[PDB]
């Protein structure tokens, strides 16, 4: 088992973690702020997913300071995790291209 593949897995596990913790923390942070919509777990989990992937439709988003802070962690964990997979794929292509180079 290579580091990049182990890193991919780990990245995926930690991301699913951030998503769950993030969903829980967003609701905890938004309830109390009038006009807030990120206030029930099911949709918060949906919000966290569309945030980690950067799709951000705009149907949901935090309006409080703590919610936004939670949002930042989720964005970063998502961007960074997916970028990690990209780097793992680059390593896999490079390694095989060297082989095919008989190097």
């Amino acid at each position, epitope marked *: 088992s290579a580091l990049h593949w182990r890193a991919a897995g780990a990245a995926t596990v930690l991301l699913v973690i951030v998503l769950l913790a993030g969903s829980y923390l967003a609701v*905890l942070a938004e*309830r*109390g702020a009038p006009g*807030a919509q990120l206030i*029930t*777990y099911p949709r918060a989990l949906w919000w966290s997913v569309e945030t980690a992937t950067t799709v951000g439709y705009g149907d949901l988003y935090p309006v409080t300071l703590w919610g936004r802070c939670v949002a930042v962690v989720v964005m970063v964990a998502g961007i960074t995790s997916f970028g990690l997979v990209t780097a793992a794929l680059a390593t896999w292509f490079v390694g095989r291209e060297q082989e095919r180079r008989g190097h």
Partner: antibody
Amino acid sequence: QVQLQQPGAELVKPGASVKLSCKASGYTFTSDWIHWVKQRPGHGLEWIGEIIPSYGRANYNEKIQKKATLTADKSSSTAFMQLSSLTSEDSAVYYCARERGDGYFAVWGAGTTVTVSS
Amino acid sequence: DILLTQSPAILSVSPGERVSFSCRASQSIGTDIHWYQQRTNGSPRLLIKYASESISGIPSRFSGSGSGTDFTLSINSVESEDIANYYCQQSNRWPFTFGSGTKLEI
């Protein structure tokens, strides 16, 4: 079995204060929120506030005068609502309800009848 | 804060008729509306969640419909046991709120 247990009544002198309780049973998830609702005779349902025991955070209906203070005892699965310095306007039936964090009140207590009088 | 308007505060129907309760929101709230029944001296009881989802243990007689700002709670074929107060509640934005309620009369 009864998921939320509330005392039937509490008599309180104007100016004084009381602490209502709401003991719970059945499934309890970290995502549960306990709500409190006020109902004056004849009138409708008024939301007072909520509390999430697993964290202890509490929010209140900022539309009305803050008479309550919510707390919870994780160990005995009991939520408490302290009403302070009451007047006859505070006389009413006070309900507690459990929401699984998905927006609706799946279950309600029988409610505690509070009467403010000398 | 979201305002919930329950039209005729009182509704009169003959035994067996189909009856419809109205609930209107001051702004669009998707399907995040719930209905409760409260009989004389009883505590509220969930009947419909999310505008039209059935609740276990509730007569098939009851159903809900709508989305956006207009919601309806319907009772197909009214009967004595349905005499009570009916309330809607929203969970779309924060201060969860209740409608003023509608009394059913047969």
